[PDB]
Design an enzyme around this catalytic site. Sequence first.
Site, short mmCIF file in Angstrom:
data_model
loop_
_atom_site.label_atom_id
_atom_site.label_comp_id
_atom_site.label_asym_id
_atom_site.label_seq_id
_atom_site.Cartn_x
_atom_site.Cartn_y
_atom_site.Cartn_z
N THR A 155 -3.96 6.37 9.43
CA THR A 155 -4.85 6.63 8.28
C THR A 155 -5.10 5.35 7.49
OG1 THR A 155 -3.02 7.20 6.82
CG2 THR A 155 -4.08 9.00 8.03
N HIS B 80 2.03 9.08 0.89
CA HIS B 80 0.72 8.83 0.33
C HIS B 80 0.73 9.77 -0.88
CE1 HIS B 80 -0.81 6.77 3.95
NE2 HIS B 80 -0.09 7.64 4.64
N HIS C 37 6.95 7.05 5.36
CA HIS C 37 6.37 6.61 4.12
C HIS C 37 5.58 7.78 3.58
CE1 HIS C 37 3.18 6.04 7.14
NE2 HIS C 37 2.35 6.40 6.17
N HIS D 3 0.81 -1.21 0.00
CA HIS D 3 0.00 0.00 0.00
C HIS D 3 0.85 1.27 0.00
CE1 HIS D 3 0.00 -1.83 4.12
NE2 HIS D 3 0.55 -0.67 4.43
N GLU E 102 -3.27 13.38 2.39
CA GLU E 102 -4.35 12.88 3.22
C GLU E 102 -5.01 14.06 3.95
OE1 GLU E 102 -2.77 9.24 5.24
OE2 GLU E 102 -3.99 8.49 3.57
N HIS F 85 4.91 10.88 5.95
CA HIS F 85 4.64 10.61 7.36
C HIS F 85 5.87 9.99 8.04
CE1 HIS F 85 0.06 10.30 6.47
NE2 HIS F 85 0.43 11.58 6.68
#
Length: 256
Positions: A195, A93, A91, A61, A103, A116
């Site tokens: 999240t 997103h 990591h 992911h 996010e 993050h």
Amino acid sequence: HWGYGKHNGPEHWHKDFPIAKGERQSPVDIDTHTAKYDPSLKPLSVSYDQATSLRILNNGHAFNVEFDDSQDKAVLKGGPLDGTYRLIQFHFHWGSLDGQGSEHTVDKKKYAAELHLVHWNTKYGDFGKAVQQPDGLAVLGIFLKVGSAKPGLQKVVDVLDSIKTKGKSADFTNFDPRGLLPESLDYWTYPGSLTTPPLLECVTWIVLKEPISVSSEQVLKFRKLNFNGEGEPEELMVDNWRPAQPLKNRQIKASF
Ligand SMILES: [O][B]1([O])O[C]C2=[C][C]=C([N]C(=O)[N]C3=[C][C]=[C][C]=[C]3)[C]=C21
Ligand SMILES: [Zn+2]
């Protein structure tokens, strides 16, 4: 299991993780006009000089860069925090397009991506115990916008070829995370959660006001990663972000 697809995306998570509809879910929209300035908010203390990165992994992911958290090598303290939080990993997103990917949002605006840097409260002994505590984690959120290249990110961007698919990992030692920090450490802070499932409500969120910029080429590489494992139908790793959740009974505090 859960994912970011149409049939298992954020809108489905609640079926396996009912906390998805909890009281302090993340991410949220940051209404800059509604956020309250707190003068008693101490300055953030980021000590990454002794950081020890171990490797980088594609977990299906996102991609995580892990650090040695068996000692206080790289810690986060100060700000709204009480105690010491060790960096365990970071990591991102990101989206399929530059107009989306972050996010958290700022006055409804979405950034091309969000970094993050995850830290756990050492008083809990290990990350596993920390995630079960309301104040077990401290996550430092940094927005990414498309523009000039970020030199401090290129080392991450060039190793991505080695971990294209789910389950792959590669040695990633001697990486300095200070190269991913903006000039200013001004921030917004509020109590929230992970999240991604299990969506535990164990996070003290600290989102930096100032974004870092990355080139279109750097974010493009992110978009060439795969959600799938090797030998499986290719699924481009893009839009691995959860939409803004209701703030409910929470107030976002600003340090500036
Ligand atoms: O909100 B984030 O995206 O950014 C910071 C962060 C850290 C960890 C997770 N995820 C977990 O900690 N998962 C997990 C898996 C099994 C048992 C307990 C926890 C998700 C996030
Ligand atoms: Zn995250």
